[PDB]
From a paper:
The major birch pollen allergen Bet v 1 is a member of the ubiquitous family of pathogenesis-related plant proteins of class-10 (PR-10). PR-10 proteins consist of ∼160 amino acids that fold into a highly conserved seven-stranded, highly curved, antiparallel β-sheet (β1–β7) along with two consecutive short α-helices (α1 and α2) and a long C-terminal helix (α3). It is believed that the biological function of PR-10 proteins involves the storage and transport of phytohormones and other small-molecule ligands.
To calibrate the observed SDS-induced compaction of Bet v 1 with previously reported structural data, we determined the crystal structure of the Bet v 1 with SDS. Consistent with previous reports, we find two SDS molecules bound to Bet v 1, which retains a conserved structure as compared with complexes with other ligands or the apo structure of Bet v 1 (8). The inner SDS binding site is harbored by the prominent hydrophobic pocket and the outer SDS binding site is located near entrance ε1, delimitated by the C-terminal helix α3, as well as the loops connecting helix α2 with strand β2 and strands β3-β4. The outer SDS is extended and oriented approximately parallel to helix α3. The inner SDS molecule is similarly extended and oriented approximately perpendicular to the β-sheet, with its sulfate group pointing toward the cavity entrance ε3. Both SDS molecules are defined by a diffuse electron density, reflecting the inherent flexibility of the alkane chain and at the same time indicating a preferred binding mode for both SDS molecules. The inner sulfate interacts with the hydroxyl group of Tyr-81 and the carboxylate of Asp-69, whereas the sulfate of the outer SDS is exposed to the solvent. The crystal structure, therefore, allows us to unambiguously assign the inner SDS with a high-affinity binding site (Kd = 7 μM) and the outer SDS with a lower-affinity binding site (Kd = 100 μM). Ser-136 is located in a segment of helix α3 (between 129 and 132) that is known to adapt its conformation upon ligand binding to Bet v 1.0101 (8). These data are therefore in excellent agreement with the crystallographic mapping of the inner SDS binding site that partially overlaps with the binding site of ANS, DXC, naringenin, kinetin, and other ligands to Bet v 1.0101. Taken together, our data suggest that ligand binding to Bet v 1.0101 is accompanied by a defined rigidification of the protein backbone along with a compaction of the 3D structure.
Residue numbers in the entry: 1 to 159
Amino acid sequence: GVFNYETETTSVIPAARLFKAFILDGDNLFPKVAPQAISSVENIEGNGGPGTIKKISFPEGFPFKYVKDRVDEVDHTNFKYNYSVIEGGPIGDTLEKISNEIKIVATPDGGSILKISNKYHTKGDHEVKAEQVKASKEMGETLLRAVESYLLAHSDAYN
Ligand SMILES: CCCCCCCCCCCCOS(=O)(=O)O
Ligand SMILES: CCCCCCCCCCCCOS(=O)(=O)O
């Protein structure tokens, strides 16, 4: 079955610039701006388009060693990014896949709004724990703020 989780957050970065950096160049930025959140990002196969497999390794002492994500869909026009956690970390005999959908909307003040949907695909009927989702939300938030700060301090990047 599927557990559906949802949340929203704001950014001081315009939608397109944030999408280009935070979403489309997370491979480069995450290990650079938040090394104590993500140690490395490895392209296993593909470009960045649908089907691309990436291996995200976490620092020593983290609850998980790594996860492998698969790019599902990339919409440059509507700033939509869909990806799935397909292996590692929480994935195993209790959890088959986590399908994520991200959308970034412009706001008139020059910022943006992020809408993220998480779907936990469980096999035999595990329960998904509140502290698992809450941890994942904290990770995403840490990544966003660290990228945000970088983009404020590096005006020439991702224009
Ligand atoms: C293994 C996947 C689950 C990880 C949960 C981590 C939540 C907190 C992430 C910030 C840690 C570091 O934050 S930082 O302020 O030093 O950059
Ligand atoms: C409200 C806190 C949540 C903010 C959203 C954070 C989502 C992380 C984006 C990773 C995109 C890159 O993922 S990738 O493995 O496919 O390259």
